[PDB]
Copies of this chain bind each other. A is one copy, B any other.
């Protein structure tokens, strides 16, 4: 039961941070990149290495203790940090033609963010149910051919960084009552990154009843994926490239019953 909003100067707080991408980081020089992508010769033999798999980013942010009152997330400012870095077309890339500049980062992208008063709830869906996911990742267990469309057994919480592969999990639409999520998948080899930045855009997190996410245990959950596309090396080999996401969340104290 949700009651009145607390007023006064000390009834509002602000959370501001960046969430770094988790693309796989195949070596000590390649933070923000995945391992080069290899292709299995059969569906059965699909066994992607961990460093070749982008994962969901998550941050649990402790808020000022209130221990009743709960912090209510009201607004979000967000954007991708470092969009201009993708203009580097001179770092040993693949020339688009004889004497031309390097092919810029492009192709399949997934841009996603969520704000919640608890962990993002996930539903597993697999492109290929026989894909063998690597040690150190948390993936849909007991997969069947029905996992390729919908298997209700695959429920999870995004409760660990560098663990939940993007391609395995989506937000669970049957749950997430205490989270607001937003995502766009743009698929295609030649898809151009279109990345907007501005400090003038605000997203309201209140639902139809004027209630935003309520932070259980005084914790705010922020989640992100920003796979911008792929970088193509001189050799033709391709790596996912990701960027950090900025979050600014304004919260207010709200009284709750039971």
Q: In chain B, what residue has the closest Cβ to A237? A: B99
Q: Does A174 contact B (CB under 8 A)?
A: yes
Is the CB–CB distance between B244 and A150 below 8 Å? yes
Q: Does A46 contact B (CB under 8 A)?
A: yes
Is the CB–CB distance between B248 and A173 below 8 Å? yes
Q: Does A95 contact B (CB under 8 A)?
A: yes
Q: In chain B, what residue has the closest Cβ to A227? A: B87
Q: Which residues of B sit under 8 angstroms from A106, Cβ to Cβ?
A: 187-189
Is the CB–CB distance between B193 and A185 below 8 Å? yes
Q: Which residues of B sit under 8 angstroms from A244, Cβ to Cβ?
A: 125, 149-150
Most B-side CB within 10 Å, residue of A96, A149, A186: A149
Stretch at the interface among A3-11, A34-42, A61-69, A215-223: A34-42
Chain A, interface SS category: loop
Distance of A148 from chain B, by nearest CB (Å): 4
Is the CB–CB distance between A125 and B193 below 8 Å? no
For the complex, give the distance between the alpha carbons of A129 and B91 in Å: 11
Q: Does A138 contact B (CB under 8 A)?
A: no
Q: Does A50 contact B (CB under 8 A)?
A: no
Q: Which residues of B sit under 8 angstroms from A43, Cβ to Cβ?
A: 29, 91-92, 233
Is the CB–CB distance between B81 and A150 below 8 Å? yes
Distance of A162 from chain B, by nearest CB (Å): 13
Contact with B along A217-248 (1 / 0, CB 8 A): 00000000001011011111110001110101
